[PDB]
Amino acid sequence: TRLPFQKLMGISIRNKVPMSEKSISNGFFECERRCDADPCCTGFGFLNVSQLKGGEVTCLTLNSLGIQMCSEENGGAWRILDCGSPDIEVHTYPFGWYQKPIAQNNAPSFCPLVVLPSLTEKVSLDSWQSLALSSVVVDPSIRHFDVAHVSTAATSNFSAVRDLCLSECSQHEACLITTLQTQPGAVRCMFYADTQSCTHSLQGQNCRLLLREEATHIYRKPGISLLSYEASVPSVPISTHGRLLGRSQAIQVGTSWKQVDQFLGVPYAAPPLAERRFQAPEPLNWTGSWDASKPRASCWQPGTRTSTSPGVSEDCLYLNVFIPQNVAPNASVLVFFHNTMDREESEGWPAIDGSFLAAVGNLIVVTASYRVGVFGFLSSGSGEVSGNWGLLDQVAALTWVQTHIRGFGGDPRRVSLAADRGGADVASIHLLTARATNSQLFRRAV
Amino acid sequence: YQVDAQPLRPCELQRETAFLKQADYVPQCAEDGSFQTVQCQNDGRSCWCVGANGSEVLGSRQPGRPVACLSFCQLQKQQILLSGYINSTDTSYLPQCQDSGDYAPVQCDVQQVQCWCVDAEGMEVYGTRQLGRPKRCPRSCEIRNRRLLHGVGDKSPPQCSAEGEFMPVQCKFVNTTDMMIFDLVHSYNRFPDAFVTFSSFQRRFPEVSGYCHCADSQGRELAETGLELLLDEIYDTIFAGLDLPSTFTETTLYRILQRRFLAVQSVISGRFRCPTKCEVERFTATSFGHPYVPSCRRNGDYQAVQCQTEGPCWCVDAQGKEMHGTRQQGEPPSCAEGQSCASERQQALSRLYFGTSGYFSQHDCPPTIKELFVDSGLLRPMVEGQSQQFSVSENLLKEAIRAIFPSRGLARLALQFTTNPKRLQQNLFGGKFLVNVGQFNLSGALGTRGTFNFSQFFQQLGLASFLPTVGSFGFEINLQENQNALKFLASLLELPEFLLFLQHAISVPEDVARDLGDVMETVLSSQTCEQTPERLFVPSCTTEGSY
Amino acid sequence: SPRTWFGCSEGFYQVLDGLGCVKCPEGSYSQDEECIPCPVGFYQEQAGSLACVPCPVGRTTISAGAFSQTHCVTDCQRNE
Amino acid sequence: VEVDLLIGSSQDDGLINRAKAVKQFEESRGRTSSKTAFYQALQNSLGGEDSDARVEAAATWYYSLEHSTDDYASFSRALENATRDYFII
Amino acid sequence: CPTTCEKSRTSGLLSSWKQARSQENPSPKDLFVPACLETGEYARLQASGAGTWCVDPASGEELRPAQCPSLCNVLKSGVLSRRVSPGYVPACRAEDGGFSPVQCDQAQGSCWCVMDSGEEVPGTRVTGGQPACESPRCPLPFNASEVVGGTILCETQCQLLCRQGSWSVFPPGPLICSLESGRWESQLPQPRACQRPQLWQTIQTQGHFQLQLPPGKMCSADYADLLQTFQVFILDELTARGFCQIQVKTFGT
């Protein structure tokens, strides 16, 4: 039977023989008969060696088929296993890593005993959250999976097959879940990404893994966050500025809880207070620890009440990034442009605490602010006074995000935008402008 | 030709030697070439069941078709066992066939030490003698594909799909200048990069021509169905940039040929498919004139209630076998002909007798189909149009999506490499082939010396040439009806809202729909599924159950 | 003529208004509807069986419980 | 350019409702004439951007708001009907 | 399928939906991912964040009254304080309070026997006969800590009582540990000797007819006429006529 595989590590080659004077079919009929006249052939290969020069046809008899990877059954959508050097060609139909029908009568005892390939780095079971069978669902449609058959050559030492598959997921950052099942012929190790399926309700917050066809033992990398914790307040490396100095808070959705590491009031442009009024973003360069543990004042709006309170000002260009603990590794970001009124009066809570859509959806929320009124959107003539102030400040925030969100743990190719009521008229303009694909700001739009 | 006519499995040899003599008896075969279980006479006044090789059993000759006779397994399992009782010498083998009558794939004796895989006809597959339990058995393709590679003639692999069963359309290549079979297990191997497109293939073999033909589940060619598809004017596709697949099957050179084969078979046979097991048995019964002609209800499956000529009558499942609780002389019976109330009555009564208080009884058309396909403007391009001039059969559109897109691995790739929906017919058939076969610019894509004999097909129509009605088999061809469907089918693919129908057809789970034709089975059925009533409602059925 | 009546089939005990049939855990084996414990010369190690498997030569601990893998040991450990 | 779109209005989105905070400072100093002049200036904008009478008299029939005489019951509601189906929805 | 904690521990590890202590206004140091046993008890002295506190089984809240007090001691202060109410004052023993296995209410209604968790074994008594439920006094076979899913009632006469929600696989004989030099006889109380029950899984009938042998009188047809050529010829002819087969309608098909 042909294996559905194209690369093998831990190979144990029993015999090799070149053949080029025969045809393909007649040369293949020699190649089956040679493994037949070998009492502990497990299977044979049949492939061109040195295909980069167009090399000749071999019939290499194998003793063991150690680990079998890069299956041709997930397509090529998600590879974490290198599928061979381009010098063998196990691709064309008469060629193939073939094996015998695996009889329960094994190879007789005079054959040289085979070993698994040795693990490079020593793995520990303490660095892998073991999970139960009652916490997954079979989903025969998921497509970011991988598979690696480890054959029944290692009859004993199930824990050495396990330490070999976990030593492969520990080398790749894309793999986060390792499920492996024994079966008649191999130990089928599979590999996944962070494939969760939570069922949010009011009486609880249950979560469980998405899996293709189930396995016995399930192993998972633990959660990790890119946020430091001194005195249990969060901080984060900004690229060229330094560290922020944020705030932590536990929130309630139904009956369960989640820590959201709220960095409120993060600046992204210079304050247009006086004579920087009616000019520009003018990007600011601070350095050190920015005190980011409180909301900032919002912008002056048409219809502003006369209460000159520290909740409204002109310098509102400040972001409120709301991050759950242990997000998805390449996370998702929602940019939400919303200045607010003075109906709240310096209470210390944000007018839209966007950390709940962050928590329930396992994503990052950057609640934004932008100049509305006459302090922005003031055009005159055909000169330097342009009249897109606040509208070019939305670019000043979206470029802050897709530069500095790699520190917070996000992914600036899944980042969205959304505006509230009438700002959605003036924040839909960015979807119109055709720009370079390498510098596209968002990727969704609500 | 003769590679299946010399191993004609001599039931079919004994038909033609008896049919030409003008005799009152002729033996009746199955589609494979084996004898049927029940043999009859031409007048239908004496039917008797037969052994393996044409010899009848020693007394079952009922004046009429028997109620039940013995399968080829249980013929052999009695014949071995009484030979171990008359001669009293034991033989350490007896078959272990299932309820269907044919052999189980795994076969061994009572001690169960060497269990091997066997062919469905009966002969032992040479090589797979394991020591106790085969994990999988080879099917009819992979046996024929490997014995080919050992070298018993015909150097071109009878390609197959995913379990070793033959695909119904088989395309082999041939040089016209010698009329010998083109070597394909070597030319796909020795020249891989020559098989990118047909323009890159015809420049490497300027004498070869494609030869596609229908075939049964045994791999042998059906009689008078072979086409010789020319491949000169086939242009390139957008699928050239992808890598070459493993075998010849998944190559884009193969799937264009089966689409060009079955699109011709639509205007010839009225089916966008090869004929199934029902339609082959109906043609070979009408040809030799013997009784028990089957009935096929336009879907390829067997029509349920089947009567023979002026005799007893019964009903049949979708496999060709008799339902044992029915043999009614006179009127035809009523076997499950939309009688699903009495089964559905039992689900309401078991929901009626389930505790109290609605703790679970709430949670006791499929889901996510009624509110995505039949409501959201996606089915409305299909069963709708401008006027009455379609007669578009919906066991042709669910055959149209099935044969054009055979699996979900194509619907993702055809949608990912498509920007303009008007370009979709170009990179799917290799041209604008539906209006070339609708408005008949196909003289140049086909050719002579393919076993269909176009000339004796056009004389009963008198419309045109290349150089009621009966099609490739006993079929009715309203050719005006068939040409109007393919004009609609080309306009179906030139829509932005078919690509958005095809995107949601990928997201259908596997258990509710196996193939994309089964997606078209459920969606065309879910348009009538009104939402389920209140859970405590129970319908009322008749005596037999008729809602 | 005994009519139709419920039972359990593969390797399970049958206890006698509901869910009465029991998994037959390890240390035992289903012979004929009554899961007899596995004899002293063998061991079972997994629930719901027909028979129990041998351990290497001259190995048990006490009796026909035959609990798990570390219960066929030599008489070196039966020295008392 | 590939970006998915999830779009949608409310039923409450009126330009009277978007000017709820605008009325509050007008009520503070006190200008009752800044409401009846606001609706007609909104009715002035109800047609085209050039305030064509051929569209403004056409659309003021269709929402049937030609009763700016005695009450602001039907005249204030049906104006919000008209602006929302041209500025919002 | 998971318990009240293994479902919550999964939510704590996978997507950080932690629980909280005291529910009033929890700081993020007051949250915890639940740590639990092989069964879903909440595993006394579970800890995360600020430090280590103690949480009673079957309820994720902490046992608010050093070492955290035992289950009898918090339930005695839960019944006498009248916040929880099974229906009796619990009876601790004088040191390391588990459950002293003579448990009954005011005015001696009905006294019954406990497990380690405190639940009924079952098998209860009325105050005319005080239920003697003591130690086994014989060691368990194969070095077992305790028999899972039950205790050992002893009247100087010991047997296995499977818990409420299970059945003993073999019938528990009235075994004897009446100071018999610390051993059993003729049967051992094996570990794992009770499993949770499960629904009926096969259905079967019988049938009766006879052949009425035509060739005279012949019960000499015995050699290869009992298991060979019969039980098989009557079986092929039974399934050729179609009686080893149920074919019913799943909505048409």
Ligand SMILES: *[C@@H]1O[C@H](CO)[C@@H](O[C@@H]2O[C@H](CO)[C@@H](O[C@@H]3O[C@H](CO)[C@@H](O)[C@H](O)[C@@H]3O)[C@H](O)[C@H]2NC(C)=O)[C@H](O)[C@H]1NC(C)=O
């Ligand atoms: C595996 O290796 C064998 C041996 O190298 C490959 O077979 C060789 O394939 C090349 C083409 O790639 C053939 O060359 C051709 O020769 C003919 C003349 O015979 C010439 O007209 C062509 O232009 C071309 O140069 C070569 O003959 C052939 N050799 C044999 C012995 O078959 C084979 O293709 C390799 N397999 C794969 C899948 O690449």
Ligand SMILES: *[C@@H]1O[C@H](CO)[C@@H](O)[C@H](O)[C@H]1NC(C)=O
């Ligand atoms: C098998 O596993 C055990 C336990 O992990 C280990 O001590 C032993 O070395 C392994 N055997 C081999 C040959 O690696």
Ligand SMILES: *[C@@H]1O[C@H](CO)[C@@H](O)[C@H](O)[C@H]1NC(C)=O
């Ligand atoms: C996140 O995306 C980047 C894109 O280059 C990739 O390199 C990285 O491995 C991804 N991380 C995870 C954990 O998927």
Ligand SMILES: *[C@@H]1O[C@H](CO)[C@@H](O)[C@H](O)[C@H]1NC(C)=O
């Ligand atoms: C901040 O640094 C950048 C570095 O390129 C510089 O161009 C910019 O002028 C600086 N901002 C100010 C206000 O000087």
Ligand SMILES: *[C@@H]1O[C@H](CO)[C@@H](O)[C@H](O)[C@H]1NC(C)=O
């Ligand atoms: C049937 O007859 C043929 C010869 O015509 C013979 O080869 C074959 O073995 C026979 N089969 C049986 C089952 O008698």
Ligand SMILES: *[C@@H]1O[C@H](CO)[C@@H](O)[C@H](O)[C@H]1NC(C)=O
């Ligand atoms: C064995 O029994 C068969 C039964 O048909 C009989 O024909 C045959 O003559 C017997 N003897 C031999 C030598 O085969």
Ligand SMILES: *[C@@H]1O[C@H](CO)[C@@H](O)[C@H](O)[C@H]1NC(C)=O
């Ligand atoms: C087909 O037949 C002609 C006959 O001369 C020959 O030249 C040609 O090479 C043949 N095709 C192949 C594949 O060899």
Ligand SMILES: *[C@@H]1O[C@H](CO)[C@@H](O)[C@H](O)[C@H]1NC(C)=O
């Ligand atoms: C059929 O007609 C079309 C349109 O004129 C033309 O492009 C095409 O080449 C014709 N087909 C053939 C085979 O000449």
Ligand SMILES: *[C@@H]1O[C@H](CO)[C@@H](O)[C@H](O)[C@H]1NC(C)=O
């Ligand atoms: C405004 O629209 C709603 C839509 O439901 C309608 O019911 C209402 O009558 C409209 N208002 C007026 C004043 O006509």
Ligand SMILES: *[C@@H]1O[C@H](CO)[C@@H](O)[C@H](O)[C@H]1NC(C)=O
């Ligand atoms: C049982 O095993 C434990 C270790 O698991 C050991 O400490 C003890 O001595 C053994 N024997 C008895 C009688 O408990």
